[PDB]
Curated annotation (Swiss-Prot):
Function: DNA-binding protein which modulates activity of several transcription factors including RB1 (retinoblastoma-associated protein) and AR (androgen receptor). May function as part of an mSin3A repressor complex. Has no intrinsic transcriptional activity. Plays a role in the regulation of epigenetic modifications at the PWS/AS imprinting center near the SNRPN promoter, where it might function as part of a complex with RB1 and ARID4B.
Bias type Acidic residues, positions: 111-117
Free-text domain note: The function of the Tudor-knot domain, also named chromodomain-like, is uncertain. One study suggests that it mediates binding to lysine-methylated histone tails, with strongest affinity for H4K20me3 and H3K36me3. However, another study failed to find any interaction between this domain and histone H4K20me3 peptide.
Classification lineage: Eukaryota, Metazoa, Chordata, Craniata, Vertebrata
Residue numbers of the full-length protein present here: 171 to 414 of 1257
Ranges where the ARID domain occurs: 116-208
N-terminal signal peptide: none
Organism: Homo sapiens (Human)
Quaternary structure and partners: Identified in mSin3A corepressor complexes together with SIN3A, SIN3B, RBBP4, RBBP7, SAP30, BRMS1, HDAC1 and HDAC2. Interacts with BRMS1. Interacts with RB1. Interacts with ARID4B. Interacts with AR.
Protein name per Swiss-Prot or TrEMBL: AT-rich interactive domain-containing protein 4A
Source organism, top-level taxon: Eukaryota
Localisation per UniProt entry: Nucleus
Length: 229
């Protein structure tokens, strides 16, 4: 059923396929202390361990919410999975207050074409996933004393080719500037880099590793603007 998609999988209790605990296949680049070996995968258990390295032999991928509720409800790990997943891995079913996420997030009613529905989805997914990885939103997206439109920064960076494609501090500056937040000084360059790197690092890592973010912007050798030296 493909574990490697970065979805929820069953991590069994080594021998018991009966009792297992679901986890999410994630990038081991999110965890510096755990490191992945070729036979193992990096899974985040929403129910138990936030980062653990387990061999793919002990991992049987499954769509937890696809399984019968009688099965789920009898095994707490499977049940909570059903609960946890329905609110963060399925399209319509993603629900958290979009206004708690930013402020209001302008999700009142939508502008087609001009506004990407992906924004709301992304904010929602990131907020859910932020909490379950042990690096939750302890501070809301505000940057430079004002509301930080998280998806704008994502879109902006993505428009620069992606953060994997960002080599210049000028870009972090430019993305921060596009939000309309006063760049002030280099501390704000720090701010924006920190923001993207803590809030979006998971999706970033996955996005850049699975080749989603990649544009001609960073497909060059020489620059048109020689860097200040």
């Amino acid at each position: 059923n493909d574990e490697l998609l970065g979805k929820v999988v069953s991590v069994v209790s080594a021998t018991e396929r009966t009792e297992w605990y679901p986890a999410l296949v994630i990038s081991p680049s999110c965890n510096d202390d755990i490191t992945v070996k070729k036979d193992q995968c990096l899974v985040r258990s929403f129910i138990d361990s936030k980062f653990y390295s387990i061999a793919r032999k002990d991992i049987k991928e499954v769509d937890i919410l696809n399984l019968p509720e009688s099965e789920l409800s009898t095994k707490p790990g499977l049940q909570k999975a059903s609960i946890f997943l329905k609110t963060r891995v399925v399209p319509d079913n993603w629900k958290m207050d979009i206004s708690e996420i930013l402020e209001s997030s302008s999700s009142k009613d939508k502008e087609k074409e001009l506004d990407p529905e992906e924004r709301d989805n992304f904010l929602q997914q990131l907020y859910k996933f932020m909490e379950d990885r042990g690096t939750p939103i302890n501070k809301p997206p505000v940057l430079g004393y004002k509301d930080l439109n998280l998806f704008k920064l994502f879109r902006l960076v993505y428009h620069q080719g992606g953060c994997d494609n960002i080599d210049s501090g000028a870009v972090w500056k430019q993305i921060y500037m596009d939000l309309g937040i006063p760049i002030l000084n280099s501390a704000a360059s720090y701010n924006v880099k920190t923001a993207y790197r803590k809030y979006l690092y998971g999706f970033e890592e996955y996005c850049r590793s699975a080749n989603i973010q990649f544009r001609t912007v960073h497909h060059h050798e020489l620059e048109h603007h020689h860097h200040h030296h």
